[PDB]
Amino acid sequence: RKKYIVEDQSPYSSENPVIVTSSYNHTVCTNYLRPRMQFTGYQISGYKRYQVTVNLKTVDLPKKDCTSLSPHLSGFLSIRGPEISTYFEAYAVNHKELGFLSSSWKDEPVLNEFKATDQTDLEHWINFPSFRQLFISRIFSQEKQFDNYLNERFIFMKWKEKFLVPDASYDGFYYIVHDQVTGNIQGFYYHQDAEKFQQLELVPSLVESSDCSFEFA
Amino acid sequence: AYSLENLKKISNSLVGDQLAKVDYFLAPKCQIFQCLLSIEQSDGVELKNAKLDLLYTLLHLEPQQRDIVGTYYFDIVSAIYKSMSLASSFTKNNSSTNYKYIKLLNLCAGVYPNCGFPDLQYLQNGFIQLVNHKFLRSKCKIDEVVTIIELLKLFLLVDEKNCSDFNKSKFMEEEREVTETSHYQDFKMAESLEHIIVKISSKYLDQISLKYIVRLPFDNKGVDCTRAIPKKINISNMYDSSLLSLALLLYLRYHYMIPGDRKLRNDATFKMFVLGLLKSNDVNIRCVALKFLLQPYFTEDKKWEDTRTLEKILPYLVKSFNYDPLPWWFDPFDMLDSLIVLYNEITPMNNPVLTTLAHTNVIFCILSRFAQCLSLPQHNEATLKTTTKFIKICASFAASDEKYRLLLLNDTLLLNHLEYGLESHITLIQDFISLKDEIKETTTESHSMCLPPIYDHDFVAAWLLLLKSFSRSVSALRTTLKRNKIAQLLLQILSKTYTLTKECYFAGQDFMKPEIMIMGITLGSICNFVVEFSNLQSFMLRNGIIDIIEKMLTDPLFNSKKAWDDNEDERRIALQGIPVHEVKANSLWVLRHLMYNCQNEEKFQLLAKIPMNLILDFINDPCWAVQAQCFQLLRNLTCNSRKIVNILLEKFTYLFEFLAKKMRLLNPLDTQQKKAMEGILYIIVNLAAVNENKKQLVIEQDEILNIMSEILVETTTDSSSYGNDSNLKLACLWVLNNLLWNTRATVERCRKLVEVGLYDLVRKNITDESLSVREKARTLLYHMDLLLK
Amino acid sequence: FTYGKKCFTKEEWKEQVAKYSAMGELYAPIEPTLPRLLLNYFVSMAYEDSSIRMAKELGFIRNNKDIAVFNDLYKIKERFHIKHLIKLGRINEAMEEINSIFGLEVLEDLHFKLLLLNLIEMIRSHHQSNDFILNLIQYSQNKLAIKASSSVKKMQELELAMTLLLFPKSLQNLYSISLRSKIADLVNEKLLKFIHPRIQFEISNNNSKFPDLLNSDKKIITQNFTVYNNNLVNGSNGTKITHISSDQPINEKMANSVWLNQRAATTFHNLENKNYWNQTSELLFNNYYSSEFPYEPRLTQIMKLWCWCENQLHHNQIGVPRVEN
Structure with a gap:
């Protein structure tokens, strides 16, 4: 009759088991920062516009203390104008041990590509109305009072490109702000011997009604 | 082959002479073993002692002489295990006879550990009675003290055959199976060991001394977050040191299985006693202190978030690598690797052990040693085992840190x-x-x-x-x-x-x-x-x-x-x-x-090779990991496909009853069972997102809506079941969104969802603590309000 | 032929001594700790008559029962008899005495030295014409070969002894009699070290009045000798990582185990190859003080300090008047 119910011999229990390990696995995602979301938009250099497309591969944001150096985001970024596709990684700003100004970061080879002078970081962050409304020796004092960076409308992060995706890359990085309620990405490119304040802004593209997952062993 | 005087002459001749010892194992002189292996009552204490001394002397060969002797050596060892009866009369033998017998038993257990020893219970009862009557009452002799030390060593050598559960955590300490007939004697043994420990260690407590500063006197013991441990405690008596070490190790084996309150492990003065013992001059004492202080991290819950104790124990665990004669029951490699894996698997992205080892230069030394071990010009078994241990510890380093992955x-x-x-x-x-x-x-x-x-x-x-x-x-x-x-x-x-x-x-x-x-x-x-x-x-x-x-x-x-x-x-x-x-x-x-993010062509290829009945053969497997992986595979298969959803429906329709029973019975406090629950909910999502027919079929069921309501009513205060989990809440909201999205039956479905009481729950979740649930709930409420006109 | 760095006259040296002479009296010009050192020396050297008289004078003996218990506790007569038998060249009888009195565990690498001295004694007894050499070759092959195999120093010692036998300048050194006394002293010290734990137990458990001459209370003695080493896993290195220098597989750079099978039943751990770390770390400091410092007579080591200090002061060109008489 009902085979998969009459034949159920899996041992069901209800007692508080040995240590509860179900939680503290900080693999937190976001409504729009899921591991398959797509974004499309334009990058404005000078007065020319190029089309850009971003596909997210993995996302694991930390909900608590995070001394690990694993990337917070990862994806593919394609720029047309022929088409150049690159693999990029990303680190989010969580107000402790990953603060705004690049001095507060660690002295590691992994984190040494996302770094610049604090004055440059100020003059690049200050162009975001979210950054302005959220408030170099004053930020250090007032950032410690911020709590629960994930429970906020805007999330700030840095994007760096590592290599090219078909058979593995410009050496700058993006200041990025993500709007959690409308899913808009806005960023600026930075390099030392480059132009000044190159634009970037993206919108969700969105299948996409059903879910499927993976998990690293 | 007789004549106690001749037995003593043979002993004097044989002491230290390996060639003569080997000569007594050949054709004409083997007759002595028929006299040595036959020790019966009323022989005489002196004669029994002479026989046992001669037999121990004869059996004391090196491996390159046991190779010459052959299997007759092991036949004699097995005869000692089987055809001797001094363990049955342990409580009636003489003290010297008992001591010599236990010494010979230790030699036998060291040279041939696979032979089955059938008289462990007699020895345990003898130990219990000896401790309870002689030692604790102070009316004991030197022979009895050394006898109980030898007994403790023999009991520590036992392999002990613990139980195997495939559903327990793979990184916690394994415990031993216990029945009732063995349980009574286990309780007696644990009581005896605890009494020995208390009696011996109560003579040195007045040697505890610590001076500290609390930031906001004596006879208060206010706070102990200092990182400083008391001054060294030293036990001058050698027999006391041996007894304390061995009794505390065996008590470690025994003490988490005995029910009770006010345990010795949970004491406030004994913990400081052991912390002071960490600085002793005796390597056995130091290693036993390390074991006693590190056991709770693996055998206790919520103990892992006590990093101050780890920070004050780690320097001595690092020091323990450098001492030349180490006991056979202490492996610093295994202890360090176990700690690193514990923290790698409970709280990833934060490893106190790795940060402490990295700030104080130890990880670089460990990696240098690993490279030097790989670069040696000549290898043997010892070097191979050391290299294996280094590889394991480096894997534990690199398991959850991109820093160490790239560094390696x-x-x-x-x-x-x-x-x-x-x-x-x-x-x-x-x-x-x-x-x-x-x-x-x-x-x-x-x-x-x-x-x-x-x-x-x-x-x-x-x-x-x-x-x-x-x-x-x-x-x-x-x-x-x-x-x-x-x-x-x-x-x-x-x-x-x-x-x-x-x-x-x-x-x-x-x-x-x-x-x-x-x-x-x-x-x-x-x-x-x-x-x-x-x-x-x-x-x-x-x-x-x-x-x-x-x-x-x-x-x-x-x-x-x-x-x-x-x-x-x-x-x-x-x-x-x-x-x-x-x-x-x-x-x-x-x-x-x-099957992740692939097309129906690939899905049908895999289903052609491995059919669906074969995948469903594991749906009720007794192991939780297999069930979880089957449910996640079913999610990936049903994701964005109507044919495979129809196949899965055909394989059952009581599919929703099956899923409802699974959801009610599974325990959300287990990682694998929670993974299976998420898989079930997202199978429901992928099934609802197919057609109007499937949307109707899912909305007809009542147990599903009951489970959804039970999940959605959970809050910060009411968190009995499901733990108020944002992932489950988002899965349920996704189910509802697929039921309402894509135009006449949709409004009926909306009215049904309102009458069941889910509209109220969605409006209640707008004030949640997680932004994702808040936004999804408010958008769903807006859409319901739009369709409710 | 001048001191220069410092030179003390007699009065200046007397002032220097008087500056600190009080510390020895307050920790316990008078040394109050001398009778106990004398009793320790007498007992540890197995001087029985002086030992008994000194114990009577200090006040630890009141009657013949006390004398018997003291002699039994410290094994003075047994140790003296063994030392005398060794000093008379009768080593087989001395070993029989050891095995009968203390146990078969004492001799089971001083046994190798005792056997060598017995061989030398047989050589001397015969000297004081080839069959004799054959008999001693058989004796050496039967007793000393396997013991000397696991070393090179013992190999050289057997070579020396066998050359000595072949003869009809270390040979005149080993042929002498001071070796007998040296080996007797080693045996006596090892016997004390072996029987110390029993003395501790009898003094503690049985509420005895006799003192622990070894190991004054507020110190420690450990029966195990351990070796600590800095240049191993620790933080004393830098922040530098050494790289692999070998491109050859481990399986090309490479038995002694026996496979045995069983005959509920209890099994034990297999301790085969469980000191891999200790055997490998020496391919990649010790507790002398508390381990083996206290097993010598204390006056001997005080005299060693005295000689060393005098020679160091001379080597550094400081002039102090030596002790007279």
């Missing part, structure tokens, strides 16, 4: 040694399979199903763990691990180990358990190369991984729903004991990853 991959000569190890194991397996028939013919007469394991199994297992740790990062998967040689070696190892299981089952269970474990680890490392956005998936698919998975999953050894043939009764009997659940879980893991 910046060597450029490590993958060469990895491939060398894998190639050597493959060569050994190929040679064994080639010589199978001759090996069987030669060793079938006495070594029927008792054959040693291949010597390289620990080495290759450590290499495979290291590879599994490396392959966890996309940068490595796309830049430095993009070698086809590694994929070839992994596939070859899978094929060879399965062939070995199929054809060489005559070698027993000692030979085959390492092969099964290697199969599990290599599957666990393959399932990472197989995922998308990794360049080796096409290579693995071209070289036939689905075929291997199909062979492995249709085998009656792994799949219990399949019946053994009539030619395989020998295999059935030989391999019945080995546990195979990691292999099944990782096979389903690999299939799940192959």
Whole structure:
């Protein structure tokens, strides 16, 4: 009759088991920062516009203390104008041990590509109305009072490109702000011997009604 | 061969003379053993002592002399175990007779540990009575003190055969199975050991001294977050030191199984006593203190978030590496690796042990030692074991930190040694399979199903763990691990180990358990190369991984729903004991990853090779990991497909009743059961998102809506079941969104959702604590309000 | 032929001594700790008559029962008899005495030295014409070969002794009689070290009035000798990581185990190859003080300090008047 119910011999229990390990696995995602979301938009250099497309591969944001150096985001970024596709990684700003100004970061080879002078970081962050409304020796004092960076409308992060995706890359990085309620990405490119304040802004593209997952062993 | 005076003359002649000792094992002089192995009552205390002394002296040979002697040596040892009866009269023997007998028993247990010893209970009862009557009442002699020390050593040598549960946490300390008839004696033994510990250690408590500062006197003991431990405590009495060490080790073995309150481990003064003992001059005392202080982290809940105690114990655990004579029951490698794995698996992204070891320069020394061990010009068993331990600890470093992954991959000569190890194991397996028939013919007469394991199994297992740790990062998967040689070696190892299981089952269970474990680890490392956005998936698919998975999953050894043939009764009997659940879980893991973000063409190819009944054979497996992986594979299969959803519906319709029972019965406090619950909910999502027919079919069911309501009513205060989990809440909101999205039946469905009371719950979740649930709930409420006009 | 760095006259040296002479009296010009050192020396050297008289004078003996208990506790007569038998060249009888009195555990690498001295004694007894050499070759092959195999120093010692036998300048050194006394002293010290724990137990458990001459209370003695080493896993290195220098597989750079099978039943751990770390770390400091410092007579080591200090002061060109008489 009902085979998969009459034949159920899996041992069901209800007692508080040995240590509860179900939680503290900080693999937190976001409504729009899921591991398959797509974004499309334009990058404005000078007065020319190029089309850009971003596909997210993995996302694991930390909900608590995070001394690990694993990337917070990862994806593919394609720029047309022929088409150049690159693999990029990303680190989010969580107000402790990953603060705004690049001095507060660690002295590691992994984190040494996302770094610049604090004055440059100020003059690049200050162009975001979210950054302005959220408030170099004053930020250090007032950032410690911020709590629960994930429970906020805007999330700030840095994007760096590592290599090219078909058979593995410009050496700058993006200041990025993500709007959690409308899913808009806005960023600026930075390099030392480059132009000044190159634009970037993206919108969700969105299948996409059903879910499927993976998990690293 | 007689004459106590002659026995003493022979002893005096034999002391220290290996050649003469060996000469007493040959044809004419073997008659002495018929007199030595026959000790009966009313012989005389002096005669019994002489016989025991002579027998111990005779049996005290070196391995290069035991090789000359042969199997007669082990026949004599087995005769001592079996045909002697001094353990039965332990409570009536003389003290010196007991001491000599236990010393001989220790020698026997050291030289031949596999022979079954049948009189352990008599010795345990004798120990209990001796301790309770003589030692604790202070009316004991030197012979009895040394006897109880020897008894403690003998009891510590026992392998003890603990229980095996495949559903317990793999990184906590394993405990021993206990029945009732053994439980009473276990309680008595634990009581005796605790009494010995208290009596001996209560003479030195007044030696505890600590001066500290609390930031916001004596007789208060206010706060102890200092990182400073008391001054050293030193036990001048050597017998007291031996008793304290051995009794505390055995009490560690025994004390978590005895129910009670106000335990000794939870004491406030004894913990400081042991912390002071960490600084002692006696290596046994220091190591026992380390074991006692580190056990709760693995045998206790919520203890892991006590990092101050770890920070004050770690310097001494690091110091313990450098002492030359270490006891046989202390391995700093295993202790350090266990701590690192504990924190790697409870709270990733934060490892107190690794940060403490990295700030104080120790990790660089460990990696330098690893490189020097790999670079040695001549190797043997000791160096191979040391290299294996170093590989394991480096894998534990790299398991959850990209910093250490890249640091280890910046060597450029490590993958060469990895491939060398894998190639050597493959060569050994190929040679064994080639010589199978001759090996069987030669060793079938006495070594029927008792054959040693291949010597390289620990080495290759450590290499495979290291590879599994490396392959966890996309940068490595796309830049430095993009070698086809590694994929070839992994596939070859899978094929060879399965062939070995199929054809060489005559070698027993000692030979085959390492092969099964290697199969599990290599599957666990393959399932990472197989995922998308990794360049080796096409290579693995071209070289036939689905075929291997199909062979492995249709085998009656792994799949219990399949019946053994009539030619395989020998295999059935030989391999019945080995546990195979990691292999099944990782096979389903690999299939799940192959089905991630693919098209119906690939889905139908995999369903053509491995049918759906075969996948459903594991839906009710007693192991939680197998069930979780089956449910996640079903999610990935039903994702964005109508044909496969129809197939799954046809296979059952009571599918919703099955899922409702699963959801009610599963326990959300288990990681694997929670994973299965998420899989079930997202199967419901993927089923609802197909057609109007499926939306109607899902909304008709009432148990599903009851479960959704129970999940959505959870809040911060009311968190009894489901733990107020944002993932489950988002899954339920996604179900509702698919039920309402895509125009006449939609409004009826909305009205039904309002009357059941889910509109109120969605409006209640707008004030949640998680932004994702808040936004999704408010958008869903807006859409319901729009359609409710 | 001048001191220069410092030179003390007699009065200046007397001032220097008087500056600190009070510390020795307050920790316990008078040394109050001298009678106990004398009793320790007498007992540890197995001087029985002086030992008994000194114990009577200090006040630890009141009657013949006390004398018997003291002699039994410290094994003075047994140790003296063994030392005398060794000093008379009768080593077989001395070893029989050891085995009968203390146990078969004492001799089971001083046994090798005792056997060598017995061989030398047989050589001397015969000297004081080839069959004799054959008999001693057989004796050496039967007793000393396997013991000397596990070393090179013992190999050289057997070579020396065998050359000495072949003869009809270390040979005149080993042929002498001071070796007998040296080996007797080693045996006596080892016997004290072996029987110390029993003395501790009898003094503690049985509430005895006799003192522990070894190991004054507020110190420690450990029966195990351990070796600590800095240049191993620790933080004393830098922040530098050494790289692999070998491109050859481990399986090319590579038995002694026996496979045994069983005959509920209890099994034990297999302790085969469980000191791999200790055998490997020496391919990649010790507790002398508390381990083996206290097993010598204390006056001997005080005299060693005295000689060393005098020679160091001379070597550094400081002039102090030596002790007279």
